[PDB]
Structure formats: C-alpha cells, structure tokens
mmCIF file of N, CA and C and ligand atoms in Angstrom:
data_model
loop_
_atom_site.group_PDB
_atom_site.id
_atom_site.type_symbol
_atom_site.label_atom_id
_atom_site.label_comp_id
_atom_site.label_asym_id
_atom_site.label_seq_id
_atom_site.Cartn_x
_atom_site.Cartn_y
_atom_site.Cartn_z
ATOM 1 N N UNK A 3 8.977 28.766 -12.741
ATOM 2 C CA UNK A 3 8.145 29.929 -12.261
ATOM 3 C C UNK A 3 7.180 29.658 -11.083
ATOM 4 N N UNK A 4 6.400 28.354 -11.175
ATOM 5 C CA UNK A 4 5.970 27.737 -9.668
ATOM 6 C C UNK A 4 6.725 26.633 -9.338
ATOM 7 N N UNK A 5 6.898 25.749 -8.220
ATOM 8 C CA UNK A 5 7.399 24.820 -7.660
ATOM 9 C C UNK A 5 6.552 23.630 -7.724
ATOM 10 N N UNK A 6 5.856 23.829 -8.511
ATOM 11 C CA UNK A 6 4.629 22.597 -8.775
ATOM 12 C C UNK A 6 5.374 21.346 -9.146
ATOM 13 N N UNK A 7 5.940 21.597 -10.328
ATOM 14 C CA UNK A 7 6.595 20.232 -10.678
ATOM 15 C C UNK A 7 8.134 19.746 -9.746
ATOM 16 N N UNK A 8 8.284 20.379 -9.419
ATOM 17 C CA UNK A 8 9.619 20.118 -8.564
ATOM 18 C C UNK A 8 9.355 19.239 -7.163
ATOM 19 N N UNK A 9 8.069 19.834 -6.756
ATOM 20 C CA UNK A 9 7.583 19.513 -5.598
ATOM 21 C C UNK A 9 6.934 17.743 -5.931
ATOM 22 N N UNK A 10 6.102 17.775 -7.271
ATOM 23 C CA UNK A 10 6.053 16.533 -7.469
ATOM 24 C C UNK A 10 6.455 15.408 -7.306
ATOM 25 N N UNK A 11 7.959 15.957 -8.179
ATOM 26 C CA UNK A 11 8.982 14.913 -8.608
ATOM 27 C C UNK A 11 9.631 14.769 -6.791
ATOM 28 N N UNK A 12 10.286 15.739 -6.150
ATOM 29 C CA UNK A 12 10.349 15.474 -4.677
ATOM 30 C C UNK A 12 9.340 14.233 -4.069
ATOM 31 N N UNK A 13 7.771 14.300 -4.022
ATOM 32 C CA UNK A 13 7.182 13.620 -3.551
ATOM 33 C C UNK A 13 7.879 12.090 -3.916
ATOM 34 N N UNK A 14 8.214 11.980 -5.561
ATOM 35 C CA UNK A 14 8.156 11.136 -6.094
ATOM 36 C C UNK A 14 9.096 10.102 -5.263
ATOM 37 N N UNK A 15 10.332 10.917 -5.008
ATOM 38 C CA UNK A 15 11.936 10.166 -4.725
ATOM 39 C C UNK A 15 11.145 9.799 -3.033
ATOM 40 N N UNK A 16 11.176 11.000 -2.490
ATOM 41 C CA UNK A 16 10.399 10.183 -1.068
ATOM 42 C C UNK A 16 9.842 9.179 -0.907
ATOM 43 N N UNK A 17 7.655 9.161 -1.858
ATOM 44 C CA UNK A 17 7.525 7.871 -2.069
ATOM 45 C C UNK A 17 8.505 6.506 -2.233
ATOM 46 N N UNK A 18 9.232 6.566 -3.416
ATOM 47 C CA UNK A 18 9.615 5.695 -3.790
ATOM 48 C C UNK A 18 11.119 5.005 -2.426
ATOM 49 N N UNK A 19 11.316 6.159 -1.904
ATOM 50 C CA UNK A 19 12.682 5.405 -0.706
ATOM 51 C C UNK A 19 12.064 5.237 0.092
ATOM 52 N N UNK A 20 10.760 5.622 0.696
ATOM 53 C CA UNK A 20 10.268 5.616 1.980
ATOM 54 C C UNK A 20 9.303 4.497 2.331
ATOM 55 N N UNK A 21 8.478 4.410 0.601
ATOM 56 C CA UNK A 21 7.161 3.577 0.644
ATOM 57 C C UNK A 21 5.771 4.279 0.795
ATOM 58 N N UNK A 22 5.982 5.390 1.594
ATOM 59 C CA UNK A 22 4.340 5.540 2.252
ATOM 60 C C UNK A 22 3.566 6.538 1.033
ATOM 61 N N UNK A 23 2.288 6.366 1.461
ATOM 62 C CA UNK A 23 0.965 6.590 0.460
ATOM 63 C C UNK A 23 1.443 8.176 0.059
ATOM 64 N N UNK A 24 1.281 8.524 -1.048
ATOM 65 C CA UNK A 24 1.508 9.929 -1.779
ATOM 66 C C UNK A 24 0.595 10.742 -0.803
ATOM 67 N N UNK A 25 -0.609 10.587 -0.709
ATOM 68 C CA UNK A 25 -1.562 11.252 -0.129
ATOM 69 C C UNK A 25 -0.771 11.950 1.096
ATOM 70 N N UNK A 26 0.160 11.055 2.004
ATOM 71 C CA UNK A 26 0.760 12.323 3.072
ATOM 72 C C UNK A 26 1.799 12.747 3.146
ATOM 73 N N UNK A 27 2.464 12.529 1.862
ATOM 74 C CA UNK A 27 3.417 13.454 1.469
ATOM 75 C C UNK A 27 2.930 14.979 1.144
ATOM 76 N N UNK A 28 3.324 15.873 2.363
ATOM 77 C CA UNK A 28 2.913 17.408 1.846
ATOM 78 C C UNK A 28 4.833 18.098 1.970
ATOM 79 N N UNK A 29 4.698 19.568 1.824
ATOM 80 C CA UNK A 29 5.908 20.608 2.369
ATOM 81 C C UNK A 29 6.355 20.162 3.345
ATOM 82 N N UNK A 30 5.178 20.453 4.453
ATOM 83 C CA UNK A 30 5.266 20.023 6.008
ATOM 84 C C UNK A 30 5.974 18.909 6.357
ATOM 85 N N UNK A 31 5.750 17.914 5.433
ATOM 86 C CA UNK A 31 5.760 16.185 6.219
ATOM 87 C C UNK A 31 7.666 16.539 6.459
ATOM 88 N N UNK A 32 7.890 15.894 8.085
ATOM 89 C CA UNK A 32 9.262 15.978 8.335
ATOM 90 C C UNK A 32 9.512 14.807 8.069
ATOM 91 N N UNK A 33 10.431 14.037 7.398
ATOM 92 C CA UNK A 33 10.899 13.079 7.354
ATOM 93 C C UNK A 33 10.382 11.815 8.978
ATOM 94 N N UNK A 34 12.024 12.110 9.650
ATOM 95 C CA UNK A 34 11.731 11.432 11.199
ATOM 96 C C UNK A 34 10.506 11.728 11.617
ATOM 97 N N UNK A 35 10.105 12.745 12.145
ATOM 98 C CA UNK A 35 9.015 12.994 12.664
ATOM 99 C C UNK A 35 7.290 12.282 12.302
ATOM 100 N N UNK A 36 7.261 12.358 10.966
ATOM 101 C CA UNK A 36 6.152 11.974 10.338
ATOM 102 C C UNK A 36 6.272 10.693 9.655
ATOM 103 N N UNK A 37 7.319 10.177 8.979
ATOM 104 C CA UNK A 37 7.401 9.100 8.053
ATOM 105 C C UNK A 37 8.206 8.073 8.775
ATOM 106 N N UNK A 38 8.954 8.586 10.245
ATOM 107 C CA UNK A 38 9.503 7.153 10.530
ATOM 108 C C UNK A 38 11.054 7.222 10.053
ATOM 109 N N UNK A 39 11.174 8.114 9.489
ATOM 110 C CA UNK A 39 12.536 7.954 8.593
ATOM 111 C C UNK A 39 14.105 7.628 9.965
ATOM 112 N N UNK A 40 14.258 6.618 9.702
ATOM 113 C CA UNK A 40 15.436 6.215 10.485
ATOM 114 C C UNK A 40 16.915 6.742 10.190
ATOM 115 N N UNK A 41 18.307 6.379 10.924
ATOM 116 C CA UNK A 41 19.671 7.283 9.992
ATOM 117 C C UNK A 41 19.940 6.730 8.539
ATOM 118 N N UNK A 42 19.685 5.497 8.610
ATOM 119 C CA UNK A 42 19.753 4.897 7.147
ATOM 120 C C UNK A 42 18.870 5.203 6.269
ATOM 121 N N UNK A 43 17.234 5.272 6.645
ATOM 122 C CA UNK A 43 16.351 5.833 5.254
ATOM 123 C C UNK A 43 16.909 7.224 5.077
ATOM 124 N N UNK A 44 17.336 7.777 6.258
ATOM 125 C CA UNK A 44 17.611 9.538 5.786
ATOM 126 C C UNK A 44 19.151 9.882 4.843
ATOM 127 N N UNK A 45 20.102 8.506 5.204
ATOM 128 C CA UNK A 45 21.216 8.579 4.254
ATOM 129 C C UNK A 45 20.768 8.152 3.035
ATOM 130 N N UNK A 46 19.858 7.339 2.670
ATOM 131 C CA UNK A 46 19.668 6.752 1.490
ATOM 132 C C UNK A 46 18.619 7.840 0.937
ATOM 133 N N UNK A 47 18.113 8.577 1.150
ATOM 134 C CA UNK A 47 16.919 9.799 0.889
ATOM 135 C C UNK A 47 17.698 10.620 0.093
ATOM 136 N N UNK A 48 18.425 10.820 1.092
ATOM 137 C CA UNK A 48 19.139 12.386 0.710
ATOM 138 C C UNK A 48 20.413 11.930 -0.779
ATOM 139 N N UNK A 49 21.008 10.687 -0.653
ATOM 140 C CA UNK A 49 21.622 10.201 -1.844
ATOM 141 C C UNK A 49 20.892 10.329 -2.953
ATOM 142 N N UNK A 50 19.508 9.656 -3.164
ATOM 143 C CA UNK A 50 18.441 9.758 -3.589
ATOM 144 C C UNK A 50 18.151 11.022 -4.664
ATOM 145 N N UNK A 51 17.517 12.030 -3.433
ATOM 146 C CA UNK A 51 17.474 13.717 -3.987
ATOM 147 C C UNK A 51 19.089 13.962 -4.971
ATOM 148 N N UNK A 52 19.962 13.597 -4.694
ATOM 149 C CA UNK A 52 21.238 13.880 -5.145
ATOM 150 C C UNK A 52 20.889 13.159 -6.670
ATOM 151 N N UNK A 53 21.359 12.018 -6.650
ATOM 152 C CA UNK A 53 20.755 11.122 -7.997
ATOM 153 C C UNK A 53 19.864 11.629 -9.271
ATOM 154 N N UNK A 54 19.006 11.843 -8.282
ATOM 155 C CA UNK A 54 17.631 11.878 -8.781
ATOM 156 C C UNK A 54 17.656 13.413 -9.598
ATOM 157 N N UNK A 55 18.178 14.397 -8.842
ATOM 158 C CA UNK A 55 17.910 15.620 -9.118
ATOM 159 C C UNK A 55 19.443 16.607 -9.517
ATOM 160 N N UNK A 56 20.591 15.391 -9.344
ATOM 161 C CA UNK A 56 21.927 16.206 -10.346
ATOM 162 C C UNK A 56 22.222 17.313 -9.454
ATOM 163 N N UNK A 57 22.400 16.876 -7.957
ATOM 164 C CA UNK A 57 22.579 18.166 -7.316
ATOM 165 C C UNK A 57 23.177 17.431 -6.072
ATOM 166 N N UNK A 58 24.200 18.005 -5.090
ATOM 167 C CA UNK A 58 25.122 17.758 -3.896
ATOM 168 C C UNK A 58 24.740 18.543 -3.420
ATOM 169 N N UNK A 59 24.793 17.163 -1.879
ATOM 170 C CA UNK A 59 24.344 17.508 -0.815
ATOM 171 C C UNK A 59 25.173 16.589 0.783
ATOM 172 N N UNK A 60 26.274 17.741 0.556
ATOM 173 C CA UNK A 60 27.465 17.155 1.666
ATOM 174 C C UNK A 60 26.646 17.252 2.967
ATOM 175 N N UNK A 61 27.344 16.578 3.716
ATOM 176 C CA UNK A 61 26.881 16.200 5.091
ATOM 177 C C UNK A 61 26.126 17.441 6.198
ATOM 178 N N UNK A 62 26.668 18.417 5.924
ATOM 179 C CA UNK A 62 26.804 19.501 6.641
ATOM 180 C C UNK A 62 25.254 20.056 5.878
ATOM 181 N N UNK A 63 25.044 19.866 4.879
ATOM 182 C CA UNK A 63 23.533 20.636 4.333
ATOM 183 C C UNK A 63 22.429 19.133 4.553
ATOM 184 N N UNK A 64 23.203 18.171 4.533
ATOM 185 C CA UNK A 64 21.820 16.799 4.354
ATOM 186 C C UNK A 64 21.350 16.743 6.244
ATOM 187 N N UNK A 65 22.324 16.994 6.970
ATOM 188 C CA UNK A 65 21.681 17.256 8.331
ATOM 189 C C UNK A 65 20.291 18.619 8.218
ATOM 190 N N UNK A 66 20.325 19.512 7.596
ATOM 191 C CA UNK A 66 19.374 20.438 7.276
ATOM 192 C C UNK A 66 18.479 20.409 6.894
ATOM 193 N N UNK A 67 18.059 18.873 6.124
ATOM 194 C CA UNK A 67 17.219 18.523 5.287
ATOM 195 C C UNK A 67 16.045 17.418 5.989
ATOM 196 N N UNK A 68 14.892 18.144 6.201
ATOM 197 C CA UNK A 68 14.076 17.891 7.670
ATOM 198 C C UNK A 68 12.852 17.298 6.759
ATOM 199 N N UNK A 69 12.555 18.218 5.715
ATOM 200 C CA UNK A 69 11.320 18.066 5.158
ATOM 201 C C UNK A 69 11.397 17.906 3.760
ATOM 202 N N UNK A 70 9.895 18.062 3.591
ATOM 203 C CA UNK A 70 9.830 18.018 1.810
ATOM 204 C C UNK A 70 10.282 19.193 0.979
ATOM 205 N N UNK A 71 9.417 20.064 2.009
ATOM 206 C CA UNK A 71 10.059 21.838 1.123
ATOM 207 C C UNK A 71 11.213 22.116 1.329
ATOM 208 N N UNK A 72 12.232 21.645 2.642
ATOM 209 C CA UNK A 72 13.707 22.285 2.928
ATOM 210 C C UNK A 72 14.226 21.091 1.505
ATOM 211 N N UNK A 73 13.704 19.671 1.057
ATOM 212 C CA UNK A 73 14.950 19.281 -0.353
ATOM 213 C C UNK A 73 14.194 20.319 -1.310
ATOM 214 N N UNK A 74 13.187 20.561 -1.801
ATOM 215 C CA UNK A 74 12.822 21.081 -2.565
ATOM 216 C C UNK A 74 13.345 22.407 -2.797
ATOM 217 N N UNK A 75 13.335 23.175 -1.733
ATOM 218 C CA UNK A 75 14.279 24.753 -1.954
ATOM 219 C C UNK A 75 15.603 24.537 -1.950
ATOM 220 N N UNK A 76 16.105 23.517 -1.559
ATOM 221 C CA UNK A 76 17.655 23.014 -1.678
ATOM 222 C C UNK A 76 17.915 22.555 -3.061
ATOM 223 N N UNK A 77 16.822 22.001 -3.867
ATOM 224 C CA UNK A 77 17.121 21.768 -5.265
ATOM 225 C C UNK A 77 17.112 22.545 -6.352
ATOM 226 N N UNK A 78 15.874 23.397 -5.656
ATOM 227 C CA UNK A 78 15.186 24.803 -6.620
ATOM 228 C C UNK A 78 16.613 25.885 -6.563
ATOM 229 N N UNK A 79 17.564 25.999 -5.490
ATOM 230 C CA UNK A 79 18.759 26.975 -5.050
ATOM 231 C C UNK A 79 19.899 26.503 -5.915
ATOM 232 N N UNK A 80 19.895 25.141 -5.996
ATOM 233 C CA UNK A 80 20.967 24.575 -6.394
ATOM 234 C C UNK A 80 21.233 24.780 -7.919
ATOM 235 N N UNK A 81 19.862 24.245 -8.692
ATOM 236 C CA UNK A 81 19.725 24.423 -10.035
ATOM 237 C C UNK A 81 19.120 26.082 -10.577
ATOM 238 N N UNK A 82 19.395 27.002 -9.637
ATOM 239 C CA UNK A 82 19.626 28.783 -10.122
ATOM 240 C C UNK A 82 20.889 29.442 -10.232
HETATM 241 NA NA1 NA B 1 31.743 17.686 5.137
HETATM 242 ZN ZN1 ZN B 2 5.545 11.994 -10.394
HETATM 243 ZN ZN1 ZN B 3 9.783 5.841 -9.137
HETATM 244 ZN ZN1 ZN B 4 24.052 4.856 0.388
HETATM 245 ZN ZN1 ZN B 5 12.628 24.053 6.698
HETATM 246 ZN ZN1 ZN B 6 10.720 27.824 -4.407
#
C-alpha cells in the first residue's frame, strides 16, 4: 500500500553491490551518474535486483534501469 519497505530492501541490494553509505542512497540517486556505477557494477546490480527480488529483468528493460525508483517500480509492476 506504500513503497516504504520495497524501497528499503532496494536500498539494501544497492548498498550491498555498490558499497556506498545508505545515507545517499535516495529515488533520485542514478546509479552511473551518482554512485560511479561502471558496465560491470550495473550487470551485477541489476542480476542482483533479479535474485534478490524473484523478478526478470532482460536486457532490453535493465538498460532502463537508471535509478533507485525506476528498480523499485520495476519490482513493485512485476510482483502486481
Ligand atoms: Na533480449
Ligand atoms: Zn534493510
Ligand atoms: Zn545484505
Ligand atoms: Zn553476473
Ligand atoms: Zn526513471
Ligand atoms: Zn510504487
């Protein structure tokens, strides 16, 4: 009913593939742009969200996947 916990657990998989401090993980944060994320952290990310959250994400949608809120509404879509 909110995205509170979804958004959490998102932070969580990021933290944990990326490394960096929870604190600047927001919606906003773009991967490349903000975290550095290279082609390999962003293949291993997006495997990650997949894993983590029981949900596919072929090539053609993981290029789409920029930020925290675009996996998060991609997971929230997936599991409705
Ligand atoms: Na494909
Ligand atoms: Zn957590
Ligand atoms: Zn963990
Ligand atoms: Zn891999
Ligand atoms: Zn977006
Ligand atoms: Zn939502």
């Amino acid at each position: 009913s909110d995205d509170r916990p979804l958004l959490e657990r998102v932070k969580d998989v990021v933290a944990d593939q990326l490394g960096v401090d929870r604190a600047r993980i927001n919606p906003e944060s773009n991967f490349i742009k903000d975290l550095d994320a290279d082609s390999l952290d962003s293949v291993e990310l997006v495997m990650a969200f997949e894993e983590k959250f029981g949900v596919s994400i072929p090539d053609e949608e993981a290029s789409k996947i920029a930020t925290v809120q675009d996996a998060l509404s991609y997971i929230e879509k997936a599991k409705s």
